[PDB]
Each structure stands twice: as C-alpha cells, then as structure tokens.
Ligand binder design. Structure first.
Ligand code: XMP
Ligand code: XMP
Lengths: 214, 204
C-alpha cells in the first residue's frame, strides 16, 4: 500500500531480514513473508516485524487444505500478527470461504492466488486460472495476487476481478506491472542491493512518475 | 507403519498434543502433524515428538509453491526432524520434483497428495486426480496420500500407483487398498485415547 511497493522479504537468516526491513521502513510499510523464514525462525518473527517496525505483514502461506484446517491455519497466522494471508483457490470455494470467515471475524484480509507461472504451472494451474478468479469474484474476494512475468495475463486477471478489486504482483517495470496491479512486489532488487534503502527509493521515484489515478 | 494406523494430530496446543501421543505410542508410531500445531508451538515441537516418543513424523504441509520455495520449505522441515512431508500435485511436476530432490539429498520421504474430498474439491481437484497420480508415478514417487472416500475409489488409485507403492488415506475395507489409515479426532478428542486406538486396531 504505502508507495505501491511491497517488500518480499525472502531472506532466511533473521539478522539480515530484520536489518533490510528496518532500512527501508521509510519507503515501504508492507512486507511479504513466506514459510521458509517463518519455519526457520518461528512465527514470532511476524510479531517482531509488526511490533518493532509497525509494518503490515502479508503471510504468503498459499493455504491449500480442507476448510476446517484452513480456518486453523488462518487463526494461528492472524493471531501471530499477520494483517493478511495468501490462499490458493485450486482447493475450491469451501476452502477459500473458511479463510474469509476467519479474516472477517478477526478483522484481517485474504488474498486469493489465482495462478502461478513457474514451470509446471501449465499442467493444471493455467487452465483453471480464469475460473478460480471468477470463483473469487463470486465469493466476494477483494484482494488478489498475480502470478509473475507475462503482463498479458495480468490484464486478463484485472478484466475479471474489476477495477475495484485490489491486485498485487511481482514484476519496463514498475510501469508495465502497475498498468494493471495496484502494487508491485519486489524482493531481490531490494534486499540484495548494497543499499536497500536506495533501491527502494529509486523504484518509488519511478512509481510516482507514473502519476497513477486513485 | 505400526499397526497400519497413523495418528492425525490436529490439536494446536503442545500439552494436549504431547499427552495424546504418549498415551497411544504403544499402539501407534507414526504421527501426522500440520501447520496449525507447528505455527502455534514452533517447529521445535517436531524434535520433541521424536526424541521423547520415538514417533515417525509426517509433515502434512500440503506444499504448493514454486520449485525454489518448495525446496526451502522441505529443507527446513526435514532439518527440524520430519521423516516425510506431504506435497500437492496441482502446482505441477517441477514443484513436486524440487521436494523429491531435497528428500533424496537428505534421506527422507515425500508423499504426493493425489486428491481431497472436502465439499469444494469437485471444482478443480477431483478432475485432476488421476493425472496427478499418474504424474507421481512418472516422477518416481513411491508414497501417496489418498482422499477420505469410499474404499472402491481407492481401488482405482491403487491400480494407477501399483502394488509396490505405499498408500495412506483417512479411514477394514480401506485397508484393502491403503497400506495405512489415518485417524484423528476419534482418537485425540477421546477422554481415553489409548482405548480409542486399541479399539480401532482390534477391528482387524
Ligand atoms: O510465480 C512466480 N515464479 C517465480 O519464478 C518467482 N520467483 C519469485 N516469485 C515471487 O516474487 C516475489 C519477489 O521475487 P523477486 O525477488 O524476484 O523480486 C517472491 O517472494 C515470490 O513470491 C515468483 N513467482
Ligand atoms: O479428503 C479429506 N476430506 C475431508 O473432508 C477430511 N476431513 C479430514 N481429513 C483428513 O483426515 C485426517 C483425519 O481426520 P479425522 O480427525 O476426521 O479422523 C485429517 O488430518 C485430514 O488430513 C479429510 N480428508
């Protein structure tokens, strides 16, 4: 949200993760954290980022279980401090709804992952992408996460979810991506930079130059 | 698996989880744990189950990310002590391959989840099940997880994966096709977990 830039904190050692995040806090307030960091350092790391830096945390857990278990995963995740959680749609409407129910009760957010673009994604994901996105619309999902690369797929997703829905995705960027996504997710280009704060600053400048309405 | 019965430990607090486990260890040696428990108590609880009870641990994490991330998830999970991890097939062969390579490197195991039967699985999962199972066969997968379903349905899954493959699924008829059955609530919510487990095993 802040500056339409989300940091994908994918480092696995706690020191570097905390260091880099604090260094860019001036320009980025939203950070995405996945399982590798959480499983190695504990869920308390989420609480630490929020408590210590006041950032918003998106748990990229790609939740993909049956309804009752999804509910428990979301509860434990929101209890630990996450503001939002990323959920798979392939498991069906029921499994997504369970996540929406907990988010509703706790005042948090669910991001629906509609497709992936890694090799192998063409086997089952690509073919179900539009239908999964439409299922999200039918479920009242308001936040979506896009695959990656291929700007043409992004345009398609936006057409399905509408102008009102919130869409985030990784990376002529940031411009190409932000023609359709509301915020761009950036990891390496920032956390592997000699001066992370400088890299974030540079990208934010590019983003502001776009003069994006609303 | 001891007595062909796997305990699905879906509780979220360490005290109840450890209590039920120690009470059924004379009957069960394999325990399946999920993110609810590990996210609530820490991945270190895996070492507690193994060092304290001698349990084999199956991490039901339904791994479903890109290859590089799946690799990291499996390495952290095996490093914490899991003997095996359950992985989704819908993200494709390469995502599954990444998990299998970490298992090969660390001497552990990967279980491919072929299907689920909850009320919504009919939308995309059911239709992909046979292809996912066949995909596992071609990737050299030897361990599979089947859905909670009528035993007749597991017959088809068994025909696909062959006689040598190892199959587990939520649960006597089921054991006509699956090598072990997975049971959770009937045992861990029981006032007497030991008696519950002993009763299930007697049904053989
Ligand atoms: O579909 C995808 N296929 C990929 O190959 C891929 N690589 C990275 N990611 C996701 O993008 C976030 C940022 O990654 P970067 O460090 O490359 O900016 C990461 O945190 C991931 O969420 C991928 N998503
Ligand atoms: O395909 C499935 N459809 C379902 O509706 C379902 N409900 C539970 N489970 C799985 O079964 C394990 C044992 O659950 P119980 O506590 O009911 O014995 C659990 O740990 C789950 O892995 C399901 N699998």
């Amino acid at each position: 949200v802040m500056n339409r830039l989300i940091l994908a904190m994918d480092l696995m050692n706690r020191d570097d993760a905390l260091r880099v995040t604090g260094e860019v806090r001036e320009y980025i307030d939203t950070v995405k954290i996945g399982y590798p960091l959480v499983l190695s350092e504990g869920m308390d790391i989420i609480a630490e980022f929020r408590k210590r830096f006041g950032c918003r945390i998106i748990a990229d857990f790609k939740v993909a279980d049956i309804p009752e278990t999804n509910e428990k995963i979301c509860r434990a995740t929101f209890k630990a401090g996450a503001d939002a959680i990323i959920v798979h749609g392939f498991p069906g409407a029921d499994s997504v709804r369970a996540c929406l129910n907990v988010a509703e009760e706790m005042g948090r957010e669910v991001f629906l992952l509609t497709e992936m673009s890694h090799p192998g994604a063409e086997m089952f994901i690509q073919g179900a992408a539009d239908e999964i996105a439409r299922m999200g619309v039918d479920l009242g999902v308001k936040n979506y996460v896009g695959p990656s690369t291929r700007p043409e797929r992004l345009s398609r997703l936006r057409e399905i979810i509408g102008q009102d829905s919130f869409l985030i995705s990784p990376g002529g960027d940031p411009g190409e991506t932000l023609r359709f996504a509301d915020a761009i997710i950036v990891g390496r280009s920032i956390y592997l930079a000699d001066n992370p704060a400088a890299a974030a600053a540079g990208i934010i400048e590019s983003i502001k130059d776009l003069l994006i309405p609303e």
